[PDB]
Design a protein around this ligand. Structure first.
Ligand code: HEM
Ligand code: HEM
Ligand SMILES: *[C@@H]1O[C@H](CO)[C@@H](O)[C@H](O)[C@H]1NC(C)=O
Ligand SMILES: *[C@@H]1O[C@H](CO)[C@@H](O)[C@H](O)[C@H]1NC(C)=O
Ligand SMILES: *[C@@H]1O[C@H](CO)[C@@H](O)[C@H](O)[C@H]1NC(C)=O
Ligand SMILES: *[C@@H]1O[C@H](CO)[C@@H](O)[C@H](O)[C@H]1NC(C)=O
Ligand SMILES: [Ca+2]
Ligand SMILES: [Ca+2]
Ligand SMILES: [Ca+2]
Ligand SMILES: [Ca+2]
Lengths: 141, 146, 310, 289, 56, 213
């Protein structure tokens, strides 16, 4: 339920992230792996060692998808149509894991960029990530 | 038992740097604006409609001191957590009826608040120990429920 | 029977009263006074040979009331909710209509099955948990004749369930309570704000909403030619004249996954009885969309009665 | 609408004592005669139910089978006692509820609660501990749990008890009390070169034990070192000159400010009733060694 | 006397009425409908504890 | 009409599956394939089911709609179309991965070691239906490696590395398997072993030196 004032903060806050989005996504992926060990079961062949290239590579594509979603904030389900099918129909990722990644991503943004995370921005960026998780998991069964 | 000695040292170390006066008000103010269904329980604290009023309300800040101190008291001994929070858990279960999830949500917000206040020092292994601490406290305050 | 005390110059003929146990309601035409006769079988004048029946009470919980958030159900104010667990531990709710029958949605019974799976495949695996934790074994799973237009399915239990203080059926209304502004209570067994299935029953009041802005929010327009799929969650709800939409609460609370089959119960203050006005069908809105789709009970009241009779 | 505080006002009118709880349907006896109050709710501030608010005056909505009844604590056969201790003022507490004897859960037990129990039993309350001594875990229904008392009360029944028969706590832990006059308590250091260095050995009512290392530190060590009259504390270890014996009872310390005159004045020190296998015996080496 | 037929989820409050002996008339003002109670002694509301008796 | 046929295989008893339904041909996605399902498939083909493998033999991906996806069979079934399948004509797999069916009479399968000084030690090589092949070393461990040594009668297995002597010819079709208990005698006794259909750039040919070298 992103209000027009809520989307303005999301676009502005994501803009201040800049080119460091790919590294932020990679750090969040690594942060969630060690903090929630059960999450590693969904990555069978990926190397889970700290600083791995695949983790860095995966973080870049995850942040790429989110940055695409911000530019298409009005129409999210179409911009995330391919990812929704892969995450729900192929890998059958449980929806509980998405709230873990969203929390870890917010922590990474808050720690690395503390000055811009006013409480107004925190709520707006939280609602944006909740919208992404629901879209991806809306066809889980 | 629950935590390795190296993990325990870092958790106790960071808790020294904290500003108890302001951290408690910060986390409570964030939960009341991010998840706006907890404003029902805090109607005794006055106006809470707008985020600045939530942050600037003296009552939530004072209640933040109580929440933070109880967290520090819980950190005194982990195995006692069942007995440490038994007195408080009854209040949150029979009088206010606070759902156990809100304990898990407040703890998660606390991790974000601590990360915001500290920065790079919130090393991913450090937050992993903190989440294990938070999960136990949320379970301990909910184990009274039956 | 106990021997009556002896009296001087009198022969005794017996006439006993019949009363149903509490939490049940007596169903008989006569007073229930049963008179002993020469044939030794007790008879009431109006009831004749048939024994009076003790049926369940509708929608009269011992503790009356005042998911993402909501209020914890601590007093057991919703004794008609029943959890249903599928193969993969994908729990789901289900309401209790009659003493032996439950009500849910069709898509709840298609989990891990094909869209045309027969009733015989679904039956062995559905695990109902009505009451506190009382497991119940089912016998039949009836779907709607049009499962593509009304997501409703009836479940028959092997034997009747005792009506305790934590188990009570809620029967169907005689009129329609789906008028905009009618605030109703929804109990849920589904995901919470962390998307993990709730271990405690929660509930929240949701108001009914105008069914034009609900369709325009989902299907783009009320004109069939200009309808386009623009559901903000990526899944199109099943919308037709047998549905009504309920928005969020005051504190921005709604229903996420796993809450299908729950009852949109409204409190009829004049009669002090809880009536089921709608059954949650599209629960995937969570906090992204602004309207949840509920199947109207009145539209399926005729069909439900026919199935129960058989 | 019958309430626990509502039942408290009721039993106060009989002037017998406090009530265990509010009860409904009058399970003990069948009602008789017309009734004047229906769905009665009371705040508890009022001295009597007559000053208490009544939903209806001169009428009753509940039938005689549904009308409530009152079970009172003084009427119940309740009597506190101590079982299996070093003396009659030490051991595991017992509460006789409904004719069945049960223990008290450890959770919520405080020095204030121990002070009330010692006053109730009858032997001096000069020094009170919150642990059971030399006793084994009992069998039965744990009638009391999370007993939170202010301390200045005549009996623990009047004290705010959570619920009769909750039994949530495990039966391994049971609340105990140590009522001492203050003369039997003694502390000594053994197993070292001098009296000021060694392993902390306690002797309460002629029972010898040790001190657990749960919260033992330098700050808590100054209290012991000062108490023995051997200056302050330097090191937590010592050099072994002889072998101390083996003891089974352990003293557990919560926290100390560091300025206390004696170890007995530290708040909430538990004597016995618990085991710390992972932790070792607490040692100390005073500066006057 | 034979037990009254049982009803599912229902309780039967037993009661017996005294019919006056032939050639006699009920002296007591009560009709004589005794009802079984928890104390095993059947009682009519009008006659109370006193048992009905028929006179010529 | 239903008709499942093997194509692009070495023989008629092994090849990539091709299923016609409604009158249109297609291939099955490899996801959900099990050795028991392939055993049921061989019953439809009529080929002997003494040894059955889930691999696809040197066959291309082709071009066609994936009619059946996530087919789950346990073996005691008349045909695989009786087993439950995820949707009909709806798929989300990659087009390259096709379900493979290999039916073996039991005599064609042979195991040999080449490139070493003795017959007991060398690069593991598998010959199935006169098709030359190697073993990818994903699951490869010492305890499954004893089966290869035991099958050849060359005692136990000591180490995976072996001393090169002569070069070995390169092959395209590759075999790999999850794991082996070690209680068995033949490699074919290991269950759910795939024979072709994928390549290993991360992983290389498995080698062994047995004790009887
Ligand atoms: C906002 C949340 C998420 C976003 C934006 C996201 C995005 C992506 C992207 C861009 C890919 C790459 C797909 C490709 O390269 O073809 C991917 C793959 C994947 N996703 Fe996520 N993801 C999210 C959450 C999750 C979570 C929480 C999990 C597991 C707990 C998960 C499981 C996976 C896995 C295992 C892959 C690997 C697929 C492969 O290697 O082929 N996703 N995701
Ligand atoms: C998660 C760990 C929590 C801790 C350690 C904690 C601690 C405390 C403490 C010590 C008090 C006592 C204050 C007093 O007696 O004056 C209190 C009061 C209260 N807490 Fe919590 N709290 C927690 C979570 C929550 C949450 C998430 C809520 C959400 C609404 C909540 C609602 C309340 C309320 C309404 C009161 C007021 C009680 C009253 O007015 O009588 N608590 N809290
Ligand atoms: C407590 O000590 C006494 C002697 O003081 C002893 O008889 C008794 O057995 C002890 N209780 C136990 C070991 O449970
Ligand atoms: C000891 O110090 C504490 C604070 O640590 C203080 O409350 C207490 O009054 C002090 N006692 C004395 C006797 O100075
Ligand atoms: C697979 O091998 C067989 C047998 O040699 C051959 O007939 C067929 O053409 C081969 N297919 C490809 C694609 O090489
Ligand atoms: C497989 O190994 C197990 C022990 O892991 C053994 O009990 C069993 O007999 C073996 N099966 C065979 C040799 O067929
Ligand atoms: Ca305890
Ligand atoms: Ca207490
Ligand atoms: Ca595959
Ligand atoms: Ca299968």
């Amino acid at each position: 339920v992103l209000s027009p004032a809520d989307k303005t903060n999301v676009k502005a806050a994501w803009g201040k992230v800049g080119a460091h989005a790919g590294e932020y996504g990679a750090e969040a992926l690594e942060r969630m792996f060690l903090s929630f060990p059960t999450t590693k079961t969904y990555f069978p062949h990926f190397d889970l060692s700290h600083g791995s290239a695949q983790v860095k590579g995966h973080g870049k594509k995850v942040a790429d998808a989110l940055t695409n979603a911000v530019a298409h904030v009005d129409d999210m389900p179409n911009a995330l149509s391919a990812l929704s099918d892969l995450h729900a129909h192929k890998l059958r990722v449980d929806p509980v894991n998405f709230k873990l990644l969203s929390h870890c991503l917010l922590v990474t943004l808050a720690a690395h960029l503390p000055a811009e995370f006013t409480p107004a921005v925190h709520a707006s960026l939280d609602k944006f990530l909740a919208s992404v998780s629901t879209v991806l998991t809306s066809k889980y069964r | 038992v629950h935590l390795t000695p190296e993990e325990k040292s870092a958790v106790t170390a960071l808790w020294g740097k904290v500003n108890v006066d302001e951290v408690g008000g910060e986390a409570l103010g964030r939960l009341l604006v991010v998840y706006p269904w907890t404003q029902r329980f805090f109607e005794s604290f006055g106006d809470l409609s707008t985020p600045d009023a939530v942050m600037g309300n003296p009552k939530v800040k004072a209640h933040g001191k109580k929440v933070l101190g109880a967290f520090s008291d819980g950190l005194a001994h982990l195995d006692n957590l069942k007995g440490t929070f038994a007195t408080l858990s009854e209040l949150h279960c029979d009088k206010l009826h606070v759902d156990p999830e809100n304990f898990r949500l407040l703890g998660n917000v606390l991790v974000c608040v601590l990360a915001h206040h500290f920065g790079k020092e919130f090393t991913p292994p450090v937050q992993a120990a903190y989440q294990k601490v938070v999960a136990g406290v949320a379970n301990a305050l909910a184990h009274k429920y039956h | 029977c106990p021997k009556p005390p002896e009296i001087a110059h009198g022969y005794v003929e017996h006439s006993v009263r019949y009363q149903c146990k509490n939490y049940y309601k007596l169903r008989t035409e006569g007073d229930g006074v049963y008179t002993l006769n020469n044939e030794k079988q007790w008879i009431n004048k109006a009831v004749g040979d048939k024994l009076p029946e003790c049926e369940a009470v509708c929608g009269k919980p011992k503790n009356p009331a005042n998911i993402l958030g909501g209020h914890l159900d601590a007093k057991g104010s919703f004794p008609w909710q029943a959890k249903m667990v599928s193969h993969h531990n994908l729990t789901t709710g289900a309401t209790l209509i009659n003493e032996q029958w439950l009500l849910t949605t069709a898509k709840n019974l298609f989990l891990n099955h094909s869209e045309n799976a027969t009733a015989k495949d679904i039956a062995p695996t559905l695990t109902l948990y009505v009451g506190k934790k009382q497991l119940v074994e089912i016998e039949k799973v009836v779907l709607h004749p049009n499962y593509s237009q009304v997501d409703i399915g009836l479940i028959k239990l092997k034997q009747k369930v005792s009506v305790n203080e934590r188990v009570m059926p809620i029967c169907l209304p005689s009129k329609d309570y789906a008028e905009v502004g009618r605030v109703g209570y929804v109990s849920g067994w589904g995901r919470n704000a962390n998307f993990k299935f709730t271990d405690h029953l929660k509930y929240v009041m949701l108001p009914v909403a105008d069914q034009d802005q609900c369709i325009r929010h989902y299907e783009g327009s009320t004109v069939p030619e200009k309808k386009t799929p623009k559901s903000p969650v990526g899944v199109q709800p099943i919308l037709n004249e047998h549905t009504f939409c309920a928005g969020m609460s005051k504190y921005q609370e709604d229903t996420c996954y796993g809450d299908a089959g729950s009852a949109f119960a409204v409190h009829d203050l004049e009669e002090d009885t809880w009536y089921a006005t709608g059954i949650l069908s599209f629960d995937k809105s969570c906090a992204v969309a602004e309207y949840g789709v509920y199947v109207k009970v009145t539209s399926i009241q005729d069909w439900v009665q026919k199935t129960i009779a058989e | 609408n019958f309430n626990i505080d509502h039942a408290s006002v009721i039993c106060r009118q009989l002037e017998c004592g406090s009530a265990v709880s509010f009860s409904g349907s009058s399970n003990f006896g069948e009602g008789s005669g017309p009734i004047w109050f229906d769905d009665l709710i009371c705040n508890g501030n009022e001295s009597a139910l007559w000053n208490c608010k009544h939903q209806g005056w001169g009428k009753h909505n509940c039938d005689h089978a549904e009308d409530a009844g009152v079970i009172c604590s003084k009427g119940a056969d309740l009597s506190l006692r101590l079982v299996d201790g070093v003396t009659e003022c030490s051991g595991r507490l017992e509460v006789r509820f409904q004719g069945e004897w049960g223990t008290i859960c450890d959770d919520g037990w405080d020095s204030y609660d121990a002070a009330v129990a010692c006053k109730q039993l009858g032997c001096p309350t000069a020094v009170t501990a919150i642990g059971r001594v030399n006793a084994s875990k009992g069998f039965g229904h744990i009638w009391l749990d999370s007993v939170s008392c202010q301390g200045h009360e005549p009996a623990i029944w009047q004290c705010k008890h959570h619920e009769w028969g909750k039994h949530y706590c495990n039966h391994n832990e049971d609340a105990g009390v140590t009522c001492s006059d203050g003369s039997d308590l003694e502390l000594r250091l053994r197993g070292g070169g001098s009296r000021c260095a060694g392993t902390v050995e306690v002797e309460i009512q002629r029972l010898l034990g040790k001190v657990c290392d749960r919260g033992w530190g330098l700050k808590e060590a100054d209290v012991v070192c000062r108490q023995l009259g051997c200056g302050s504390a330097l090191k937590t270890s010592y050099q072994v000159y002889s072998k101390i014996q083996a003891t089974n009872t352990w003293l557990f310390l919560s926290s100390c400010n560091g300025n206390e005159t004696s170890l007995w004045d530290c708040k909430n020190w538990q004597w016995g009733g618990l085991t710390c296998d992972h932790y070792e015996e607490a040692k100390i080496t005073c500066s006057a060694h």
